[PDB]
Amino acid sequence: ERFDAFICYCPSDIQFVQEMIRQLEQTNYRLKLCVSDRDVLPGTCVWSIASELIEKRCRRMVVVVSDDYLQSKECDFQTKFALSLSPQKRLIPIKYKAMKKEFPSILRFITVCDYTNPCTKSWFWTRLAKALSLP
Amino acid sequence: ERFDAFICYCPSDIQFVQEMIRQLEQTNYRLKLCVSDRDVLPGTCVWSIASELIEKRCRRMVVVVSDDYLQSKECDFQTKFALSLSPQKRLIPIKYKAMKKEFPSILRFITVCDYTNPCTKSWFWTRLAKALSLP
Amino acid sequence: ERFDAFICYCPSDIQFVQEMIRQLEQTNYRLKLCVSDRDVLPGTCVWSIASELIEKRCRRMVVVVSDDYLQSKECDFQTKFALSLSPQKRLIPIKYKAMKKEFPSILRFITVCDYTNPCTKSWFWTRLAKALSLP
Amino acid sequence: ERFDAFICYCPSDIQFVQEMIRQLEQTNYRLKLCVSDRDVLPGTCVWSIASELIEKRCRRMVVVVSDDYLQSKECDFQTKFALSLSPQKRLIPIKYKAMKKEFPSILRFITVCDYTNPCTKSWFWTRLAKALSLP
Amino acid sequence: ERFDAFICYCPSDIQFVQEMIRQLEQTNYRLKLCVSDRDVLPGTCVWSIASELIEKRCRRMVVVVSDDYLQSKECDFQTKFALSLSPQKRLIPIKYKAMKKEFPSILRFITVCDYTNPCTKSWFWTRLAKALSLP
Amino acid sequence: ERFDAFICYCPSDIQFVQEMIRQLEQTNYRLKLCVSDRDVLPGTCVWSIASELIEKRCRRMVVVVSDDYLQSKECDFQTKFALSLSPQKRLIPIKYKAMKKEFPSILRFITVCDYTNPCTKSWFWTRLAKALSLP
Amino acid sequence: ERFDAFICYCPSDIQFVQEMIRQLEQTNYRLKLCVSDRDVLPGTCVWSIASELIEKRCRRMVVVVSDDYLQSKECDFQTKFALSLSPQKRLIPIKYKAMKKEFPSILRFITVCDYTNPCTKSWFWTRLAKALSLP
């Protein structure tokens, strides 16, 4: 029923989401993350997963930014529907890979949780799990 | 008499349907799937399998989308007759193979149950059997 | 509300439909023909004009067969939905022009009301108005 | 305050909107249409005109489809936000000009109110004003 | 002492500011606009006109966007200092000329008060004077 | 029976009258214009269309002035019969084309509704429909 | 009903009148100018626009002097009818273009509001709007 974070990801980047499940769910933190290919029954309509999941069930939204994120359209609509909801840091962008294109200009005024820097990798999962566990 | 899911498939893709029978009928789930080459006596008229089976006997319909699905016409009429029935997720599209053409534009607003992704194959049959077993 | 005949036509052949309105409605026969560009409000969904008009409101269906009829798809679905309804001569095909392609093979077992023959044109409108006015 | 129809249009097509104001507001129908360049004070935020105008103030939405409609992004987000609202024919697409590209595939299952056909122009404004005036 | 709107402009665009003084001050609206070359004594320090004028004296800020606006740095710092103040539509961007470069990406989520459109020029000054006169 | 405006035109200028029907009848104004080639049965006498139509049925008269208007005689007699009726602006002259002869000297003391000026074309149809709709 | 200034112009000079409407009506001055091709219904008599408009409705009269002004006769009669009314500066002549003929000798004892001088163009619209707004 309830969750803690909807996860918006391109389908070419599920190896990172499987890592996130291991680090945040199967660890001693006990967090619940709604993943689309795991908690959504087939046959649903697309306009209900924005009006029911992102609106009334999840509390935050994690945007897995990548290079193939800039080609899909459902991620664009879900990102803009999340930004349209503003009454608490309700949008967390994550960069994990070497991008060679431009960053999304919509997200330039939010602080990204970077992973590709080979000197700051000790603070990543602690900051992320402290962010998601906040009320 | 009654069923749980009509199955709409091209005749060049029955090796997958034979696998589906093994995974959903001969397993501990006990589901009943109406297959055309197994439960329809020869000599019937084509306009009765849409007015009697899909209307009053089956409860859902599973569309085995493929590359040779885009050439047959009975699958087109049965898909559109299923979409014309709307009073519950009464249409489940399944992709199982590497398609090289375009996806059907009629089905773009329903969530597909994908199988060709080599990282998500553990959730496939559980999601499908949880979807078909719903009232 | 009620009607007497739904009219299925390609949009490139409305000059004949305007003639049919003059010969069957504005004449001393007093028939009511549901035309799509005249009795359907914009904003409707396409899957309701087959489930409500052809099913429960009109009593027959007139198929204006032509050369550009073989390219549209909504006429194909409406023709096959009309043929799927069989409990009374509930489908009347009309040929009015010199076709250079093949006749539709779906309609070969129904008697066409031909118009292009320059010797039989006296019986056309009388036969058509006697057919449509039957209960 | 209240309205009857939000109007979604590309800024290169305001000559048609000025005609629509003359035919629907300054005529004997007395309809109120919220236009962006006429009723929105400058300095507003873009994410409030979807959460306040389209949600709680207007009752329907008129999409002026054109060739330059396929390049803007705010019309894409407003169209998809309108489609995401589904509890009454709450979306009316209008074609008024000779398009040379493809029609939008998102809107193929709603009936368009066509204007470029030189034989049906007598029914256009009557159908449109009967549609907008419905409760 | 008090004002109603600080005006941030490039020094190559004072002919428009002189027009704005005629249309908003010397007209029957009686508005007070703090202009830098008219109300600031020489010899002041630059870091006081942001901490005293924009903070505690003016109520809004009008950004005269142009092509030479993208080269100055004091306008960049004053724009970002205005955006950093967020407790009411406290920033009004104005476009008056044909720009050939890109719009500033910082201001894309605020509604611009456009002037170069040759069909909407009747609403410009009324909207602007209704915006500035609000409490 | 009743009308709003008799229309006096040379038979070489019916393409403009067909445009006038589209702009004033098939639009949201609902005006009725008596046209000779559309509402007069053949076999009538010419001296009754001036004693019955222009006298007791129509309320105004629209004179489509052109270059070939100066050759017909029935337009001369109908214009002079209209001028002989004076008890309200009961005669509206319309110029739509580049004339190379002289204007009619009989009509020099009435204000013409000009159309060939390429700067005033926005006011034409609004002025004409406001004139014809007056009691 | 009421106005502020009748405008007497040759029909070959309406591009300047369209500019005057933008500078005096659609600006923050809110003046009302009676233009003949915009506020006079067709079918009126010419001898009423001097006895009703210039006499009892407008308060001043603006004479757009030009080179083609010296060929029309209605401007001559309206100028002399305005001069015959003398009980307040009730006649304002405007020169805007390079004339190559002589100035009108009737108007030599009134001060012209010149526009073609490339050094005095800053005072033009302010003087004109201060003149027209006087009681």
Within 8 A of F127 by CB-CB distance, chain G residues are 38, 41-42
Task: Count how many residues are written for chain D.
Answer: 135
Note whether A touches C: 3 CB pairs or more under 8 A.
Answer: no
What is the gyration radius of the CA atoms in chain D, in angstroms? 14
CB contact under 8 A, B91 and A43: yes
Task: Please give the Cα distance from B68 to D27 (Å, whole number).
Answer: 56
Compute CA F90 distance to the chain's CA centroid, rounded to the nearest angstrom: 10
Q: In chain A, what residues touch E105 (CB-CB under 8 Å)? A: 105, 108
Instruction: Give the chain C residue whose CA is nearest to the CA of B83.
Output: C47
- What residues of C are in contact with residue D112 (Cβ under 8 Å)? 42
Question: What does residue F126 show for φ and ψ, rounded to 5 degrees?
Answer: -70, -45
DSSP code string of G34-89: E-HHHH--TT-BGGGIIIIIIIII-SEEEEEE-SGGGT-SHHHHHHHHHHT-----
Q: Give the chain B residue nearest A44 (alpha carbons).
A: B89
Q: Which of residues 5-34 of F touch D (CB under 8 A)?
A: 22, 25-29
Question: CA-to-CA distance for D10 and D69, rounded, in angstroms?
Answer: 6
Interface check for A134 against chain B (CB to CB < 8 A): the answer is: no
Q: 3-state SS string over chain A?
A: CCCCEEEECCCCCHHHHHHHHHHHCCCCCCCCEECHHHHCCCCCEHHHHHHHHHHHHCCEEEEEECCHHHCCCHHHHHHHHHHCCCCCCCCEEEECCCCCCCCCHHHCCCCCEECCCCCCCCCHHHHHHHHHCCC
- Taking contacts as CB-CB distances below 8 angstroms, the residues of chain F near G38 are 123, 127
- Give me the residue from B50, B51, B84 closest to C51, CB to CB: B84
Strand-pairing partners, residue C33, are: C5
Question: For residue F113, which residues of chain G lie inside 8 Å, CB to CB?
Answer: 42
Task: Give the CA radius of gyration of chain G.
Answer: 14
Residues in chain C with CB shorter than 8 Å from the CB of D92 are: 42-43
Q: Which residues are within 8 A (CB) of C19 and not within 5 positions of it... i.e. 6 or more apart? A: none
Would you call C124 an interface residue with chain B, using a CB distance cutoff of 8 Å? no
CB F92 within 8 A of CB G42: yes
**At what resolution in Å was this solved?**
3.3
Q: Comparing C-alpha atoms, which of C32, C17, C27, C44 is closest to residue D119? A: C17
**What is the rounded CA–CA span in Å between residue D91 and residue D83?**
8
Q: How far is C-alpha C132 from the chain's CA centre?
A: 11
Which residue among G36, G40, G43 places its CB closest to the CB of F91?
Answer: G43
DSSP B75: H
Q: How far apart are CA B70 and CA D72, in angstroms?
A: 32
Partner residue opposite D42 with nearest CB, options E109, E119, E131: E131
* Interior/surface letters G85-100, b for 16+ CB within 10 angstroms, e for the rest: eeeeeebbbbbbeeee
Contact assessment for residue D72 and residue D40, using Cβ atoms and an 8 Å cutoff: no
A88 Cα to chain E: minimum distance (Å): 15
For residues D62 and D6, is the Cβ–Cβ distance under 8 A? yes
Q: Residue D5 corresponds to which amino acid?
A: A
State how far the Cα of E63 lies from the Cα of E6, in Å rounded to an integer.
9
Is residue F51 within 8 angstroms of chain G, CB to CB?
no
Give how far D55 is from chain A: nearest CA, Å.
Answer: 12
Q: What technique was this entry resolved by?
A: cryo-EM
User: What is the rounded distance in angstroms from the CA atom of residue B9 to the CA atom of residue B1?
Assistant: 21
- Token readout for B34 is 């109406």
Contact residues on chain E for D43, CB-CB shorter than 8 A: 89, 91-93, 110-111, 113, 131
- CA angle at residue G54 from G52 to G60, to 5 degrees? 150
**Pairing mode, strands C33-34 and C5-8:** parallel
Q: F128 and G42 in contact by Cβ < 8 A?
A: yes
